[PDB]
Amino acid sequence: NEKDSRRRQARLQKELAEAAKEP
Amino acid sequence: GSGQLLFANFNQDNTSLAVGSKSGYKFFSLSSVDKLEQIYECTDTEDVCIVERLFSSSLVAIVSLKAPRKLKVCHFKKGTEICNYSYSNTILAVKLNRQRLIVCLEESLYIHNIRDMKVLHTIRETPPNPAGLCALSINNDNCYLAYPGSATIGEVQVFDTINLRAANMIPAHDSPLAALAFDASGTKLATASEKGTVIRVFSIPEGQKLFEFRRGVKRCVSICSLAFSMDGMFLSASSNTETVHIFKLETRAFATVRLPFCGHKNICSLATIQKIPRLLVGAADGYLYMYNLDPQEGGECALMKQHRLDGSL
């Protein structure tokens, strides 16, 4: 369950970085 | 319910207007004064009472009246929810910059890392702040949070949200704080109290008074909105009356505007649009009012345009 929590956190980090990109 | 408005605010550099309503939320471009161009609408979440963009990125933080303790962070162009977080009490304000997202509750403030939404620090047992009054610097380099350090005295707590430590408390006013704003550099903070006689500007983080502007003779007023121009040269102060005062940070208001509608809180910003400095006022009658500032001579500013906040023509 902890390896999967780390997987979800890595996905969240990637998605937040992508959404914060400015043109 | 697109006409039943709940919220309006500007983004960090006054390039976007966000409007929340019973039906959802909308963004409008502020690149023109002659038209108010809608650039986005979302109706997936109803009763949107807070909507905060990150500059002109795709990241938005949303709160709905249906779940007033829940923050949703979304990629609005993809239409995806990235994450959500629920708090112990009603969210009163959300502020963000490129490093941090702040959530204000009545008795606590949450400081999130916006890169991963983890809570880095919680300020607990604050002086009760049912208005959600707080300010967050928009600057990449000077990342301070300001909030009331007393509910009965106008003391300002200044907190460094990178180092996660306090700066000096500023004893800004005797009476309680009514409004707070950082300039775009994060190195100046404007304050006003419930008494409303003066608007003060302090250096940050040193807390030294730099300017004191007489709003006027003392009177019953509730200053609701302070805003700096992006170059820091002008500071506007609006209230529940018809007058918006614009002060010039140099060494009587430099300019003034008389709103067609008053009686309620409004939101203002100072923005240069098509090479002319403007005062933008969002009002509770559902209009955005657009005035021109003469930065050399000031005086009474002319109303150039008004637009419906709900996007109507």
From Swiss-Prot, chain A:
Residues 1-22 are annotated as: WIPI2-binding. Proteolytic cleavage by activated CASP3 leads to degradation and may regulate autophagy upon cellular stress and apoptotic stimuli. It is found in: Cytoplasm; Preautophagosomal structure membrane; Endosome membrane; Lysosome membrane. The WD repeats are required for non-canonical autophagy but not for canonical autophagy. The WD repeats are required for the recruitment of LRRK2 to stressed lysosomes. Homodimer. Homooligomer. Heterooligomer with ATG16L2. Interacts with WIPI1. Interacts with WIPI2. Interacts with RB1CC1; the interaction is required for ULK1 complex-dependent autophagy. Interacts with ATG5. Part of the minor complex composed of 4 sets of ATG12-ATG5 and ATG16L1 (400 kDa); this complex interacts with ATG3 leading to disruption of ATG7 interaction and promotion of ATG8-like proteins lipidation. Part of the major complex composed of 8 sets of ATG12-ATG5 and ATG16L1 (800 kDa). Belongs to the WD repeat ATG16 family. Plays an essential role in both canonical and non-canonical autophagy: interacts with ATG12-ATG5 to mediate the lipidation to ATG8 family proteins (MAP1LC3A, MAP1LC3B, MAP1LC3C, GABARAPL1, GABARAPL2 and GABARAP). Acts as a molecular hub, coordinating autophagy pathways via distinct domains that support either canonical or non-canonical signaling. During canonical autophagy, interacts with ATG12-ATG5 to mediate the conjugation of phosphatidylethanolamine (PE) to ATG8 proteins, to produce a membrane-bound activated form of ATG8. It is linked to Inflammatory bowel disease 10: A chronic, relapsing inflammation of the gastrointestinal tract with a complex etiology. It is subdivided into Crohn disease and ulcerative colitis phenotypes. Crohn disease may affect any part of the gastrointestinal tract from the mouth to the anus, but most frequently it involves the terminal ileum and colon. Bowel inflammation is transmural and discontinuous; it may contain granulomas or be associated with intestinal or perianal fistulas. This is Autophagy-related protein 16-1. It comes from Homo sapiens.
Curated annotation (Swiss-Prot), chain B:
One of its GO terms (molecular function) is protein-macromolecule adaptor activity. Induction: Expression is repressed by ZKSCAN3. It is found in: Preautophagosomal structure membrane. Ubiquitously expressed (at protein level). Highly expressed in heart, skeletal muscle and pancreas. Expression is down-regulated in pancreatic and in kidney tumors. A motif (L/FRRG motif) lies at residues 213-216. One of its GO terms (biological process) is autophagosome assembly. The keyword NAD does not apply. Changing R214T: Impairs preautophagosomal localization. Keywords: Autophagy, Disease variant, Intellectual disability, Lipid-binding, Membrane, Phosphoprotein, Repeat, WD repeat. WD repeats lie at residues 5-32, 39-76, 82-114, 121-161, 165-204, 210-249, 254-293. GO terms for cellular component: cytosol; nucleoplasm; phagophore assembly site; phagophore assembly site membrane; protein-containing complex. Its main location: membrane. Coiled coil: none annotated. Belongs to the WD repeat PROPPIN family. Interacts with TECPR1. Interacts with ATG16L1. Interacts with ATG5. Interacts with WIPI1. Interacts with WDR45. May interact with NUDC. Interacts with ULK1 and RB1CC1. It is linked to Intellectual developmental disorder with short stature and variable skeletal anomalies: An autosomal recessive disorder characterized by severe intellectual disability, speech and language impairment, developmental delay, and cardiac, thyroid and skeletal abnormalities. Skeletal features include short stature, camptodactyly, fifth finger clinodactyly, thumb hypoplasia, overlapping toes, and kyphosis or lumbar vertebral abnormalities. The L/FRRG motif is required for recruitment to PtdIns3P. Component of the autophagy machinery that controls the major intracellular degradation process by which cytoplasmic materials are packaged into autophagosomes and delivered to lysosomes for degradation. Involved in an early step of the formation of preautophagosomal structures. Binds and is activated by phosphatidylinositol 3-phosphate (PtdIns3P) forming on membranes of the endoplasmic reticulum upon activation of the upstream ULK1 and PI3 kinases. Mediates ER-isolation membranes contacts by interacting with the ULK1:RB1CC1 complex and PtdIns3P. This is WD repeat domain phosphoinositide-interacting protein 2. It comes from Homo sapiens. The gene is WIPI2.
